[PDB]
């Protein structure tokens, strides 16, 4: 084997560099030319808080098996990740670095790195995705603690010890470093804000949440204290191996990418453990805006399938908010989840309601979906009853956004209603003024439908549209649908 300082990075990276004139973002969705310019052991800024250099950890920390899966990764980025682990970690704490080559196009990307000290390469015989790939690496791990890292990261000064200390003290703690930013355009390494936590909206997409005023205030005594987080980013974390196994590893039916970070986060919290972000542990990551690799069936479908598997097993009744926020997800088969449901039962996990109240109280539950009230706007004007009642005409007036005579509802029976009065086409003759009359389910004269991107109101069964061109001559009328500005009506919820 060769010690990493002696690895021929030039020969390794040189065999896949971007040709002149070719798109430097095509293969990885990050600038490969800039990644290739960097040395495998390039220096990076110490982004840690000053108090970190004084924080201590036990001497007898458990060694870890570092698992890095990868699929068509840029050679320079993959090598740099491996070297950062070897250079920035105490050798006695790195039992091995397991590279799981998830069926990359060129087997040499991984095989060539197998000559480096402590690197073990496991190539999947077929594409497996990150979930099954991480499990393969974990299953092969010989250490008592697992460390997962994406294949485009750069570990910082004393990044490992703070993480291991947490797990050595309590095996049920799943911890992650503050993830610094490696710019996808010019690869500069920049420190992430330390006032963040992992979170998500009801569309179940991971996002970074900024701490509330009180949370920041409470950390003034010790700014580098662990940060309990509702969710971990997903690709960078440390976990006791036996705990990873007994808690259920990963849902093996999840494919490619997405949703597994949500699943393990819910599972760990609901089933007794905890998730932490450790300020003194810093690791940079090349964040991208798009995945460069393929998703069988499309990324949208795969993400929805994986997410449904997580939601259907862990969120209880709250899963309905996900389907409300993401309608397209309801029509996505997700397969059998019995093994996971049984896992939850066996582990005697707490309900999702408990998770929301005790772990993520910041996430607000949305109101139930129902018919919405609002204004029908045209320019800066709003459909106005004019203060009229039955048999009276309607018109338009400057919107005041105070409801009242400008508040309407587009009902399911297709009426345009204000309280108990509805817009009525008393005369279909083009140019006829419409009138307000009591709403009746079986009055065909009160039926309207939105058309053209919900920008107009057409009387059902006719080619007549609500028109304000007669507003100064008696009130709104029905007119042959045409390109007139006077026929534009937008429903704004309020």
């Amino acid at each position: 084997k060769v010690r990493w300082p002696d690895f021929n990075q030039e020969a390794y990276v040189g065999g896949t560099m971007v040709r002149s004139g070719q798109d430097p973002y095509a293969r990885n969705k990050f600038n490969q030319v800039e990644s290739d310019k960097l040395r495998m052991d390039r220096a990076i800024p110490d982004t840690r808080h000053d108090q970190c250099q004084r924080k201590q950890w036990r001497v007898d920390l458990p060694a870890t098996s570092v698992v890095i899966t990868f699929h068509n990764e840029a050679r320079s980025a993959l090598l740099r990740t491996v070297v950062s682990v070897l250079k920035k970690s105490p050798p006695h704490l790195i039992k091995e670095i397991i590279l799981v080559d998830d069926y990359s196009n060129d087997p040499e990307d991984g095989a060539l790195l197998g000559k480096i000290e402590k690197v073990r390469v496991l190539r999947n015989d077929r594409r497996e995705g990150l979930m099954r790939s991480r499990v393969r690496g974990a299953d092969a791990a010989q250490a008592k603690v697992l460390t997962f890292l994406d294949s485009h990261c750069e570990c910082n000064e004393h990044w490992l010890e703070p993480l291991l200390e947490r797990v050595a003290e309590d095996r049920t703690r799943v911890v992650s470093p503050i993830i610094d930013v490696i710019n996808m355009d010019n690869f500069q390494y920049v420190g992430a804000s330390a006032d963040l936590k992992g979170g998500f909206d009801w569309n179940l997409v991971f996002k970074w949440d900024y701490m509330t005023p009180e949370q920041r205030r409470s950390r003034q005594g010790n700014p580098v204290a662990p940060i309990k987080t509702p969710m971990i980013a997903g690709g960078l974390f440390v976990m006791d191996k036996f705990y990873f196994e007994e808690l259920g590893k990963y849902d093996m039916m999840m494919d490619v990418w997405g949703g597994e970070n949500l699943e393990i986060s819910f599972r760990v919290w609901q089933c007794g453990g905890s998730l932490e972000i450790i300020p003194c542990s810093r690791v940079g990551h090349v964040f991208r805006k798009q995945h460069p690799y393929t998703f069988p069936g499309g990324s949208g479908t795969v993400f929805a399938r994986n997410t449904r598997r997580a939601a259907e097993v862990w969120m209880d009744e709250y899963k309905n908010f996900y389907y409300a926020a993401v309608p397209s997800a309801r029509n996505v088969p997700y397969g059998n989840i019995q093994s996971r449901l049984e896992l939850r039962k066996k582990l005697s996990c707490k309900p999702f309601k408990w998770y929301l109240e005790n772990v993520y109280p910041e996430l607000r539950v949305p109101d139930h979906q129902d018919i919405a009230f609002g204004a029908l706007q045209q320019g800066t004007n709003c459909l106005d009853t004019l203060g009229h009642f039955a048999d009276g005409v309607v018109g338009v007036y400057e919107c005041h956004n105070a409801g009242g005579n400008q508040e309407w509802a587009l009902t399911k029976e297709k009426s345009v209603k204000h309280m108990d009065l509805c817009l009525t086409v008393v005369d279909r003759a083009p140019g006829s003024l419409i009138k307000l009359q009591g709403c009746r389910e079986n009055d065909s004269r009160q039926k309207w439908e939105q058309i053209e991107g919900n920008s107009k109101l057409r009387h059902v069964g006719s080619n007549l549209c609500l028109d304000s061109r007669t507003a100064k001559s008696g009130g709104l009328s029905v007119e042959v649908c045409g390109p007139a500005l006077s026929q534009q009506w937008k429903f704004t919820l309020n």
């Binding site: 930013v181 420190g191 992430a192 900024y210 690709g235 964040f287 798009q290």
Partner: peptide, 9 residues
Amino acid sequence: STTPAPTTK
């Protein structure tokens, strides 16, 4: 579509 980058220091 991917893991978003956090706000920097």
